[PDB]
Amino acid sequence: ALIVPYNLPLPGGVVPRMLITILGTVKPNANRIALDFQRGNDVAFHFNPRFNENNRRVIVCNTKLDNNWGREERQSVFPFESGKPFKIQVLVEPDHFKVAVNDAHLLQYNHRVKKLNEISKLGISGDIDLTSASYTMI
Numbered sequence: 001a002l003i004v005p006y007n008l009p010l011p012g013g014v015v016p017r018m019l020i021t022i023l024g025t026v027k028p029n030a031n032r033i034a035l036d037f038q039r040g041n042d043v044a045f046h047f048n049p050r051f052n053e054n055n056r057r058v059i060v061c062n063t064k065l066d067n068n069w070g071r072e073e074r075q076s077v078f079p080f081e082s083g084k085p086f087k088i089q090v091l092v093e094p095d096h097f098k099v100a101v102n103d104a105h106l107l108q109y110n111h112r113v114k115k116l117n118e119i120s121k122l123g124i125s126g127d128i129d130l131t132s133a134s135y136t137m138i
C-alpha cells in the first residue's frame with residue numbers, strides 16, 4: 001500500500017483531457033476521505049466523503065483560497081462503503097472536474113481556480129488503504 005497521506009505531483013498542472021485515477025480500499029470504520037487538488041497552499045478542488053456527518057453520509061466539495069474555505073457543494077449520492085475497494089476517476093474538462101466512482105458518474109465541480117497549469121499537486125488523505133494513484137491523457 002502507498003503511504004497516506006500521499007502527494008501525487010501533477011507536472012505542469014492540470015489540463016483538459018487529463019484523467020486522474022485513484023484505486024484504494026476504504027478502511028472498515030471509516031470517517032473521512034479527502035482528495036485535494038492544490039495550487040500551492042490553495043485547494044482548487046477538495047473532494048471530501050464524510051461517512052458520519054450527523055449520522056448521514058455526504059460528499060463535500062469546496063475550494064480553499066488564502067486559508068478560507070468557500071461555498072460547499074454537497075452530493076448525497078455516496079458510492080463508498082467501509083471495507084470495500086473503489087476507483088475514483090477525475091477527468092479534467094474545460095469548465096469542470098468530472099468525477100466518476102466505480103465507473104458511474106458522480107458529480108462535476110466547476111473551476112473556481114482558473115490557472116489550471118498551476119494546480120500541480122494532488123493530496124490523498126483519510127481512511128483508506130491506497131493502492132495506486134496515477135494520471136493519463138485521454
Ligand SMILES: OC[C@H]1O[C@H](Sc2cncc(Br)c2)[C@H](O)[C@@H](n2cc(-c3cc(F)c(F)c(F)c3)nn2)[C@H]1O
Nearest residue numbers: 032033034046048060062069070071072125126127
Ligand atoms: O468546506 C470543506 C472543509 O470543511 C471543513 S472546515 C469548514 C468549516 N466551516 C465552514 C466551511 Br465552508 C468549512 C473541514 O474541516 C475541512 N477539512 C477537512 C479536512 C480533512 C483532513 C484530512 F486529513 C482528511 F483525511 C480528510 F478526509 C479531511 N481538512 N479540512 C473541509 O472539508
Ligand SMILES: [Cl-]
Nearest residue numbers: 071072073074
Ligand atoms: Cl450554499
Ligand SMILES: [Cl-]
Nearest residue numbers: 112113114115
Ligand atoms: Cl486562479
Ligand SMILES: [Cl-]
Nearest residue numbers: 133134135136
Ligand atoms: Cl502517473
